Curated annotation (Swiss-Prot):
Region Polymerase: start-end pairs: 198-601
Protein name per its UniProtKB record: DNA polymerase I
Residues of the full protein shown: 324 to 928 of 928
Organism listed in the record: Escherichia coli (strain K12)
Entry EC no(s): 2.7.7.7
Family membership noted in the UniProt record: Belongs to the DNA polymerase type-A family.
Keywords attached to this entry: DNA damage, DNA repair, DNA replication, DNA-binding, DNA-directed DNA polymerase, Exonuclease, Hydrolase, Nuclease, Nucleotidyltransferase, Transferase
Keyword presence, Membrane: no
Molecular-function GO terms, alphabetical: 3'-5' exonuclease activity; 5'-3' exonuclease activity; DNA binding; DNA-directed DNA polymerase activity
Superkingdom to which the source organism belongs: Bacteria
GO cellular component terms, A-Z: cytoplasm; cytosol
Domain 3'-5' exonuclease: start-end pairs: 1-194
Length: 601
């Protein structure tokens, strides 16, 4: 176990000051905060823990208020004595998910500096796919130590206690162990993170500096109009009713809009071909093939889609508005994706349909406050530009260089015809090839996206590789080093380990080869986006203009800018994004604005 003998519980100023003195001369120190809620903006700090050396850690309770809780240093007195140390950029701190801790302190007017090491990110940069990067998983992987779980001291279910309700000593065991373990994890991982300059570079200049900027974006939140979302909800109810009637009217009787049950009994029973369509799906959608002529499958297609969107965003979004700020605070995850891109939840901004009309209405609900406007800064087809650079292809490089539409430029080369005459179908064919290459799509998978026969798709890809030889080379070379060293890297050095590259399993090894071609372009896009965020945030902090960075979704950064400042600010965001990141890839940033996210998008 871990008893009350392990760590000290600081209940007096004199002892706290003794520790602050030791903390001041430590080379690095682990630090952690305890609160009464996972919600950063409204959580209250219940206590703090520190670790100066493996096995030497302490817990300082400041707001435990259960019946008869012992005297504790007051939250205000503890923070004023600790403030200088916390705000000192020279005092280096180590922590697990420091983004959270930085925010809690910000609730009390404290600016946490010296945010040097985050064990979550150390683990993530070492090997993004090694497993989960949370402390409990980390302590077990690297230290063969099983940590005290929050459930162990607080309980489970609705009757679960909040930190302020837990006994001082019990809270101490948990909090001081976090600090201690975090320091031990750093001592084991930091030395390893130096065996390679690639990962070390990404960790030091991309991931760590991004920690406080993610905190600031999350805490800023985004303005959502609940009325608009409600109208959209009422209207969708009516549209779902109408659509259901249109389905019944086309055939007979009533039925659910569920395939492999009520649909096959209608659809193919009235002429068609037996198999159904899985909601596997992004490759063989039987329902949308029939949709080009057959009416029923087209209405069932649209019905399901609207049903999904209503319960996911229309009904959910209004419930996420924080009472304290009046805004929605999404959760960004910095150590979850395999390629290094940021993910998002509650809400998952990336699942809002882009090329769909309803998704546009969801976006219209993201509004700018009075006298402000929503500004969108996007990296135009960054992955494609990255592939152009990685393949060193003069053809692609020149297309982007002279500002031509790469999809029409590619079609003009593949099909051999003037750029002005390329048709929509030809452009659509080249476009499917271009994005297919990024995901390492098979010549048959391209046929399923283009609806053309196999070997006809193969005919296009051979014509493509002949016109753009540099792309085949990159593809072959990347699969090469992937087998030679078990991993692939981005331009900045970020690595994706591929354990199934020599799998001996067929499909399992195919996946690893696709990931081999894909990761370098996706990871590089990710690195670029993170560098722009740090650069834009740095300008924001230094110059203090009337602008907030509110979102990050796909390849765009969304802001709130004062209406009278839009022009100067747009010039600035634009320069920072395509000139203060990587100077090797030919980058283009498209900046737009409006009353809501949809207008600026
Ligand atoms: Mg191309
Ligand atoms: Mn913590
Ligand atoms: Zn903790
Ligand atoms: Zn993208
Ligand atoms: Zn420019």
């Amino acid at each position: 176990m871990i008893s009350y003998d392990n760590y000290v519980t600081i209940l007096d100023e004199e002892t706290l000051k003794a520790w602050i003195a030791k903390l001041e001369k430590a080379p690095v120190f682990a630090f952690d905060t305890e609160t009464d809620s996972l919600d950063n903006i409204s959580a209250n700090l219940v206590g703090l823990s520190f670790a100066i050396e493996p096995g030497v850690a302490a817990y300082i309770p400041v707001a435990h208020d259960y019946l008869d809780a012992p005297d504790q240093i007051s939250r205000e007195r503890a923070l004023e004595l600790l403030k200088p140390l916390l705000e000192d950029e020279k005092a280096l701190k180590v922590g697990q998910n420091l983004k959270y801790d930085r925010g809690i302190l910000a609730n009390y007017g404290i600016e946490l500096r010296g945010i040097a090491f985050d064990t979550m990110l150390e683990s993530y940069i070492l090997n993004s796919v090694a497993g989960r990067h949370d402390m409990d998983s980390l302590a077990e992987r690297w230290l063969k130590h099983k940590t005290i779980t929050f459930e162990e001291i607080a309980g489970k279910g609705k009757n679960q206690l909040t930190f302020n309700q837990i006994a001082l000593e019990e809270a101490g065991r948990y909090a001081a162990e976090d600090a201690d373990v975090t320091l031990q994890l750093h001592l084991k991982m930091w030395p390893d993170l130096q065996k390679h300059k690639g990962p070390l570079n990404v960790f030091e200049n991309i991931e760590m500096p991004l920690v406080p900027v993610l905190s600031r974006i999350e805490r800023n939140g985004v303005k959502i109009d609940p009325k608009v979302l409600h109208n959209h909800s009422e209207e969708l109810t009516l549209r779902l009713a109408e659509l259901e009637k249109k389905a019944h009217e086309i055939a007979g009787e009533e039925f659910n809009l569920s395939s492999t049950k009520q649909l096959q009994t209608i659809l193919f029973e009235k002429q068609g071909i037996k198999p159904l369509k899985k909601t596997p799906s992004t490759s063989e959608e039987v329902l949308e093939e029939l949709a080009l002529d057959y009416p029923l499958p087209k209405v069932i297609l649209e019905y399901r889609g609207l049903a999904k969107l209503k319960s996911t965003y229309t009904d959910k979004l209004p419930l996420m508005i924080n009472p304290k700020t009046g805004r929605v605070h999404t959760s960004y995850h910095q150590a979850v994706t395999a390629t290094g891109r940021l993910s998002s939840t509650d809400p998952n901004l990336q699942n809002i349909p882009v090329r769909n009309e309803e998704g546009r209405r969801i976006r219209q609900a993201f509004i700018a406050p009075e006298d402000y406007v929503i500004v969108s800064a996007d990296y135009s087809q960054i992955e494609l530009r990255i592939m152009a650079h990685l393949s060193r292809d003069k053809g692609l490089l020149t297309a982007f260089a002279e500002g031509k539409d790469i999809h029409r430029a590619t079609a003009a080369e593949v099909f051999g015809l003037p750029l002005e005459t390329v048709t929509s179908e030809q452009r659509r064919s080249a476009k499917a090839i271009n994005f297919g290459l990024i995901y390492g799509m098979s010549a048959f998978g391209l046929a399923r996206q283009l609806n053309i026969p196999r070997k006809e798709a193969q005919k296009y890809m051979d014509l493509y590789f002949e016109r753009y030889p540099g792309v085949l080379e990159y593809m072959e070379r990347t699969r090469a080093q992937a087998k030679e060293q078990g991993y692939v890297e981005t331009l900045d050095g970020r690595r994706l380990y591929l354990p199934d590259i020599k799998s001996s399993n067929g499909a399992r090894r195919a996946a690893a080869e696709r990931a081999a071609i894909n990761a370098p372009m996706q990871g590089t896009a990710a690195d670029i986006i993170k560098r722009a965020m740090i650069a834009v945030d740095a300008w924001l902090q230094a110059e203090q203009p009337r602008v907030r960075m509110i979102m990050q979704v796909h390849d765009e950064l969304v802001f709130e800018v004062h209406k009278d400042d839009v022009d100067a600010v747009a010039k600035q965001i634009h320069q920072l994004m395509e000139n203060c990141t990587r100077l090797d890839v030919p980058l283009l940033v498209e900046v737009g604005s409006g009353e809501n996210w949809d207008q600026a998008h």
